[PDB]
Design a protein around this ligand. Structure first.
Ligand SMILES: Nc1ncnc2c1ncn2[C@@H]1O[C@H](COP(=O)(O)OP(=O)(O)OP(=O)(O)O)[C@@H](O)[C@H]1O
Ligand SMILES: Nc1ncnc2c1ncn2[C@@H]1O[C@H](COP(=O)(O)OP(=O)(O)OP(=O)(O)O)[C@@H](O)[C@H]1O
Ligand SMILES: [Mg+2]
Ligand SMILES: [Mg+2]
Ligand SMILES: [Mg+2]
Ligand SMILES: [Mg+2]
Ligand SMILES: [Mg+2]
Ligand SMILES: [Mg+2]
Lengths: 322, 337, 337, 322, 322, 337
């Protein structure tokens, strides 16, 4: 059997024919303004007409930012390329950080050469360019690869499938990476990029204490469209606990569902969805097939949330190391 | 369909200048900025005459005023015969070469050497730049290091042997020098050592014309702590010719929206043009540029043809801008990290 | 005699848990920490079932309380069938690869791929991890780069071709995935970029269970200046399950000394056990652990058999502890540099 | 035709037989104390008797510091080696910064081996020392190359031509480069070095805020001779605008010369000499062969000086990015 | 003849059969508590039963910290491996600093394979692992080398001789090296490590100004045993001057011994033991075979101690460079 | 004519010391500094006897007092038989090797191993240093890495196999050890880690005598923030023997000018000697040294023979000194960057 991870229940955005968001469809619950805005972005990626448009998902942690972009990746399918990328991946020891951004920008534009094969522009970049080493590939190579792909389209052997680059954790880029992203988003070959951050009003890395919203400078925030993600209500937290219980195969009683909903509004959404599998293992240790309230109450005494652990750190700060 | 698509500067076919360099109000995808496009055309005749080495021009002004749009207008107005190396200011920070060596390679990429060869008799033409000659003669099998980019630091002694050979050819008539441009956008991202290398690289006989763009104010230089205008020291600002760019009015913002609604191929109503110009004057120009395509997709999902004001107001509620985004962050500033 | 000897955790044969995960007061070399060993056993059944990817548990608490001792108890309770990569937090700072690449190699070392081959008929078994497959297919003669460790950064494109092939094999039944654990001890020694890589590496379908240990309080993160609990940002602390560890009482400190005097094979008198428990409650547990072996050698040089209280008091005068060491340094603080 | 750059009009120092400076000779105008001092330095480079002497040109920017050293290079000719070098060139990724200084020190001493060939000591260093890489060449090699060149002189096959190293922008060296330059200038094989700086009373790089004049420490300023360069008068600015107009082939009326002299005393010398070629292109756009006052007045409205652009930045500082 | 260095008179700890320290035996004088504590550590290294125990020698400079560990190395002999290591050696340009600690940890455990050969675990590590380069050797290699050495013991071909690692100057490690040393000392294969420092209440390197005793964090000071080294009395200083005079072959009069003892209590112990050989060379210049008081008085006027030179620096601070 | 010419120390043939090490007032190109040259000669007999390993001497004093001039006096007084490695303090900061490895190579370059070989019978002599033996045995074709300098870090295990072989040869009589000197000038440019490597490298049996020179006062160490005398920590200053150097008087400054006017071969008048001594006492010694040659060229351009006071006053007006230079900069401090 396949392993069940986080966002394994996400099977696309829950929209109808009219493009409005359903309250509960395809594993997505709530957040209807962000889901209609992400459905308008999905239509852009499919129109294959625009290039270099940039989307920022913004909000508190635990509010569906990585889940909304993986719902975009499920709504596009495996035909459209998708290139997830953490923003801390640019600090390679082998190549410069703008080359890691440019290699990810070329990895997200696809070409289907026909007998059918799937290739990216970066695959043609490393094919036309001892211990192997990453190399800072010049724009001299990239322009004639763009002419070769243009001749491959004009004889009909190839078909281009522009895709999407997800730069999750965009606040971990430094100021040189944002300033190269100005020139990268201004090109007519760039992929549609979806950025994500949860680090509002923090300093840019690589600068000595200048402050901008989301960790992103105002000259890059001019070029993106913002999608905010408003926090969840108690009722929608319980629906996320219900969907994660059906995804992990866990039966649950309604009183334990009300207790895990009170736990998830007490601490956070993510602590209550990782209380499911330890309470299920405690239920199979006791031999009962479903979780009751005593299993959630005992497992919640065994594991702590970050706020209760911070209260333990504040009460006993002379004992811990600094 | 093709590798190229509708980018942010794909509507600009060139600077809309007449025979007397005087700018037209709306021509070749450009509108507004009449003193800046006239100064850009005087710099364009300086690049096309090719006589004076090492001239430098800064394009300064507010964000959204079209510094980069003037530079891609002059990039399509040169044509493919004259080289135009367009780099970012963050691209000089390489792990395989120094910032001096990366600026020297960006300087020598913009000097084309047109070599002809007569070889019953056919004149084959091998236009090539000075950087490719320095990479080919740097080592055996060095012609693949233009492709993979794994050249290190080319020796300065090798570059004097190429500059002397090219001078010899030029006087023997075997080669024709076509000097070109180097666009360093976001130049503020260079440090003091790289700015001081620009102080002496522009005085060389083989230097290209160097255009640069900065939206920065009186700020600190990246390698030091002193404050100077545009993020650039006054030792380098002595060597330039600043071209200011004015902020747009209402009619200029509206005409940027009509040239863009054409490039994206969207038909909009005139009431939606007035509401989108009011949105583009209230917040930002580029926010009103990205509302056009997403408003066209809201009009496609309702199966209409003409984009109405309600599609603009629906997409204005769907996607936020920094101003409104920052306001909402004020409340969850204790929720945001 | 052999490569292995009496280390700091060599007495721990495993967590002393019964069938119902309930911890025994003194079993398998472990004593005390009943809620922490029960939570460690629930995490042990989560690792042995192998179903849920990317779970993460922090072991927090005071120094000397046995966070690492619970982790080597679960390391010997897994056995050699399930992989257990045990790294330090300072080991990601490599000169030959990035911190993202070093954490990706530490992530993929803990996912075992058991391949069988039928080859008159004998089923040879080649258990191998996902990291070894990515090093073998990274280059020709890449199988010696597991040994010498001179792999650079493996390309991400290569890792998608291995993940797809392994998924194909797993559905064809040629391979069995045995997910494992990654113990990052002293995790506080990671920086903000590596913590943000952990924010997305744990959401992957192939992530191992990630145990981590921290003795730190509300301190500054290593890459930034903000203060957060355990030296870890709240963006990553949202993804974990904290297991607190209580400080020991008198009888628990005395029973740690009896299980240790057995591993070091020293016979001590009961009055020396009471005096060593008073020393171990006054100063530190680990200081009273290292007094046992040196007290045994003071007992061997007098040619006795039983370790008396005078051997404890002589070795207590011979070797100091931070508290007494710091006091003596107060006077020579003008003599010390 | 050859391209015309900055310092293309400089054809040597303007001295007579007595060594006094002329007011206007060989493209040099004014600055007579610095030109007699640079003529005494030219005689030292030709005496070929001294080694490791060091000259600092000091002054305001735009006062003839790079022009006075290129006049030294024109007065020596192509027989004496000259090695221009920016001071920011020492931060190579391949070798240490003292090796870049030592390779430039050996590049400035020449040897003529006879059929006649011209070689430097660094050419023999790299000849007697896969991707090519610069290597940190040991003294062990440099001492036996010095013995081989000494044997080449004693059999008469070679003749040494010691030269000059110009380390323009010497304030961009860090404190390790100045401290290695102490040992480098103390040798009996070192070339005569001419340093240049315009960065008076600024901190040394590589130190945490200690202040010395010209960006150079006081222990290196003990070892150099200072040549100050006093600013130009209005009359000499007009003579520089006249010489740059004859060098670039530009005809100019006397009233436009008086207006460009008032512009050059209003802002700086360099802004008025880059107003020549745009006014000439505007004159050929209008079809007139010479520049009048209306061409300088229109081109001066099109392009700004740095002080007027700083006044625009001070008046509108809330709109520009920080 | 062999050269005579510092600690050339150290021939082991001066202990009897009972393990108490003699006042003057085997070149060691005084410091009896530290010598009985180091003799209890020698018995541990010979019991070959423990692994990863850690000793800190602590005290003022010039108090027998490097001398007490070289007395441990003389009491073990050449059969037990000993690996001296400065703590500033971990900042290699080729490998990471924890690999330099791990390579030194494997260099201190020996194996005698039998025809008799002596090898370490690091020698087998580099044997089982162009310009040569140090490589970051994985734990994948080290576990099967540990299985191969275990099979070599079980067939009787090899015998393990665990040894000692001396990390002198342990305050020059940064905070990552101390935190890897937590995991390194917790292993059952680690060598017994003797650390040394003289830098009490100073900041850890790699941290922004947090203060711990000896330059070592409190979480590593929990894992070590402290041996303090109390300063010497005037009488023992004279005995060190007497032992260094017999070691260097220098005859000395008793009045010059009393004058060098007053000099060594006036400044420091080390300045008076480097006044021996210059006074001996001045005595052979005068032709006398033994040193008198006039030779120590003249040589003490020629060479200065650090406190008198600091008094010269304080009186004339406007003349010296900053 | 030859590779060598008149440098700053080319007049110094050695320390002017007699049989009893007593310094002569003016001999062998040296004048003044009688206690410093006598202490330098006692260190010279310590280097020539070769018996004591790892001795260290700091030459401290004011700039222009001749710390380096005493060190090149002892460098020509040793001769070419005894090695003298003379490095700068900034030369240890290498990109291809660590500072510990660069100091170990500078330590082992100064220990000569004279090997003889009898090979009808002729004793060929191959004097070589310990560093060359460690580079030859470091790899195949490693003898060109002395030349090109592309050795990395030589392994410490290799250096113990060379030290043991050399000890064996020395006891068999095949080799003769000639220990030498290591001059680290401007030692203040080393950091705390390199100073702490010097704390243990000087205690080795194969360490050369280490001379060092510093003009610095009570300043901060380069790797830390603490203030210590000479820029050197008191942990290393415990291991040295400081040699102070006194500032010169009028007659000593005048006699430095007569020994230098001879090396540069310039004949000066006695009134010009008094005026140049007054200039050399007012501003600096080294400024009056560089006025001699440029005053000789002003005398050559007037076609005289004797240098007069007017040539000194003309060259004093031509070239400035820091004091006068700094004054003129006070006015244009708003013109200077
Ligand atoms: N003069 C113009 N004519 C037509 N379109 C324009 C003009 N100026 C700007 N635009 C449009 O506005 C967009 C933003 O302009 P541009 O990116 O050139 O700004 P900029 O001045 O370089 O600012 P920044 O410093 O923020 O990059 C362009 O992509 C183009 O679509
Ligand atoms: N005792 C001396 N005898 C003769 N000439 C001397 C003497 N001392 C100095 N000089 C001359 O003065 C010059 C400067 O002396 P030197 O460079 O040795 O100074 P220093 O003490 O090392 O100072 P700094 O720290 O500035 O380098 C020497 O090059 C030499 O020409
Ligand atoms: Mg996320
Ligand atoms: Mg722009
Ligand atoms: Mg622990
Ligand atoms: Mg200049
Ligand atoms: Mg020591
Ligand atoms: Mg000196």
């Amino acid at each position: 059997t396949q392993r069940i991870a986080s966002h394994s229940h996400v099977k696309g955005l829950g929209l109808d024919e009219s493009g409005l968001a359903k309250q509960a469809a395809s594993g997505l619950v709530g957040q209807e303004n962000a889901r209609e805005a992400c459905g308008v972005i999905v239509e852009l990626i499919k129109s294959k007409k625009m290039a270099g448009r940039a989307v920022l998902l913004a909000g508190p942690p635990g509010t569906g930012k990585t889940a909304l972009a993986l719902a975009i990746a499920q709504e596009l399918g495996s035909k459209v390329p998708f290139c997830p990328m953490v923003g801390s991946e640019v600090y390679s020891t082998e190549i410069k950080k703008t080359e890691v951004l440019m290699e990810n920008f070329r990895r997200a534009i696809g070409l289907r050469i026909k007998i059918i094969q799937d290739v990216t522009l970066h695959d043609l970049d490393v094919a036309n360019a001892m211990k192997p080493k990453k190399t800072e590939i010049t724009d001299k190579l990239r322009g004639e690869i763009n002419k070769v792909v243009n001749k491959y389209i004009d004889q009909g052997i190839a078909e281009l499938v522009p895709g999407v680059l997800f730069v999750d954790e965009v606040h971990m880029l430094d100021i040189e990476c944002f300033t190269y992203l100005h020139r990268a988003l201004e090109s007519s070959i760039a992929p549609i990029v979806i950025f994500a951050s949860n680090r509002g009003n923090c300093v840019i890395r690589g600068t000595e204490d200048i402050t901008s919203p989301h960790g992103i400078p105002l000259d890059l925030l001019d070029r993106v469209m913002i999608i905010r993600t408003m926090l969840y209500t108690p009722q929608e937290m319980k629906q996320i606990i219900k969907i994660r219980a059906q995804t992990e195969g866990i039966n649950i009683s309604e009183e334990a569902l009300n207790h895990l909903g009170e736990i998830g509004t007490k601490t956070t959404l993510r602590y209550s969805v990782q209380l499911l599998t330890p309470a299920n293992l405690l239920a199979k240790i006791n031999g009962k097939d479903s979780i009751e309230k005593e299993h959630v109450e005992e497992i919640s005494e065994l594991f702590y949330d970050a706020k209760s652990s911070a209260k333990i750190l504040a009460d006993q700060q002379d004992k811990y190391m600094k | 369909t093709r590798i190229e698509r509708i980018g942010a500067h794909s509507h600009i076919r060139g600077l809309g200048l007449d025979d007397a360099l005087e700018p037209r109000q709306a021509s070749q995808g450009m509108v507004g900025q009449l003193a800046a496009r006239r100064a850009a055309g005087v710099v364009l005749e300086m690049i096309r005459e090719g006589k004076i080495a090492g001239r430098a021009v800064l394009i300064a002004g507010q964000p959204g005023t079209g510094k980069t749009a003037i530079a891609m207008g002059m990039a399509q107005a040169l044509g493919p015969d004259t080289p135009f190396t367009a780099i970012a200011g963050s691209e000089i920070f390489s792990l395989e070469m120094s910032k001096t060596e990366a600026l020297t390679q960006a300087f020598r990429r913009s000097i084309g050497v047109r070599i002809k060869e007569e070889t019953k008799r056919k004149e084959v033409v091998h236009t090539v730049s000075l950087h490719e000659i320095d990479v080919i003669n740097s080592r055996t099998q060095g012609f693949l290091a233009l492709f993979s980019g794994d050249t290190g630091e080319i020796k300065s002694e090798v570059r004097e042997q190429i500059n002397a050979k090219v001078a010899e050819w030029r006087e023997e008539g075997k080669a024709e020098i076509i000097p070109g441009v180097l666009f360093i956008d976001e130049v503020h991202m260079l440090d003091i050592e790289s700015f001081s290398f620009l102080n002496r690289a522009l005085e060389s006989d083989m230097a290209p014309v160097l255009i640069m763009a900065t939206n920065r104010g009186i700020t600190r230089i990246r390698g030091t702590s002193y404050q100077s205008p545009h993020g650039i020291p006054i030792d380098l600002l002595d060597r330039l010719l600043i071209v200011s760019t004015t902020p747009y009015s209402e009619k200029d913002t509206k005409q940027i929206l009509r040239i863009r609604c054409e490039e994206e191929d969207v038909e909009m109503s005139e009431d939606a043009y007035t509401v989108l110009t009011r949105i583009g004057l209230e917040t930002s120009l580029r926010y009103a540029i990205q509302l056009i395509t997403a408003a066209s997709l809201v009009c496609r999902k309702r199966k209409g043809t003409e984009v109405q004001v309600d599609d603009i107001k629906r997409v204005y509620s769907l996607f936020l801008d920094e101003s409104r985004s920052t306001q909402y962050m004020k409340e969850y500033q204790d929720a945001f990290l």
